[PDB]
Structures are given as structure tokens and as C-alpha cells.
Amino acid sequence: SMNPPPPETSNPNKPKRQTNQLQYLLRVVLKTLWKHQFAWPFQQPVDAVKLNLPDYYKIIKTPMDMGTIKKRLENNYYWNAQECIQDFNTMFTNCYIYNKPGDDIVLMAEALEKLFLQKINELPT
């Protein structure tokens, strides 16, 4: 296919380890962005076939989306909160480097990123 397999979301051999930062990332950060009116383009991996972006996966080396992030948090895939924050950053970067400024998708990403950064400013210690 033109699309890669979706990013892995489970680590069967990683110990289960909770942190209050990971709790905050799921219950505050992800939850707030997931319910936002602009979340929908970001709730699943980019399907370059259905969306007619044939060059997407030639330009975007590390695909990322909030559906993947949500499942990773639910599955305790991340060893630490910084790994999760990096995935959010990657998702936004992909959008900004692939799409044209002023495309509706970019304005939607920017609104979500603003909310993301506001919540990250209150990440517990």
C-alpha cells in the first residue's frame, strides 16, 4: 500500500509504570484535545490514499496522530511523559511542514497546538 502500517501502540514486555505526568497527559491533555471541535483530522493516522496525498509518506518520516497517542497512553506504552510530548510535537510538525500555510488543516492544528502548549505549561512536576 501507499500507507505504512500504523505506529505500534502496545509494548507487551515493558513493565507497567504510572506517573502523575502520564496521568495528566491522558486525563487532561489528550482528553481536552480529543474533544475539541478541530480534533477530527488528527484522531487517526493520515490515509494518503483516501485523502489523495500520494507524496505524504515520502515527506513525512515519522507519522503521528492523536489516535495513536491515545492508545499508547491507554496501553502504558510510554516510559515517560516526555516521549508522549514528543509525539504531540511530531504530529504538529508533520502538519506544518507538509501542508501550505493558510490551509484549513494548518489553522486547525495551530488551534490544537495552542491548547496543547497551555496544558503542558501546567504539567505536574
Residues near ligand X9K (CB under 6 A): 40-42, 46, 51, 53, 95, 98-99, 105
Rounded Cα distance between 33 and 112, Å, is 6
Q: Which is nearer to ligand X9K, 84 or 112 (CB)?
A: 112
Nearest to 117 by CA among 80, 95, 79, 85: 85
Residue pointed to by grid coordinates 484549513:
104
Nearer to ligand X9K, 22 or 69 (CB): 69
d(CA 16, CA 34): 24
Whose CA is closest to 7, among 57, 59, 81, 79? 57
Closer residue to ligand X9K, CB minimum distance, 15 or 102: 102
* CB nearer ligand X9K, residue 53 or residue 123: 53
Tell the smallest beta-carbon distance from residue 109 to ligand X9K (Å): 7
**In whole angstroms, how close is the CB of 88 to ligand X9K at the nearest point?**
13
Q: Are 46 and 53 in contact (CB under 8 A)?
A: yes
> Shortest Cβ contact with ligand X9K: which residue?
41
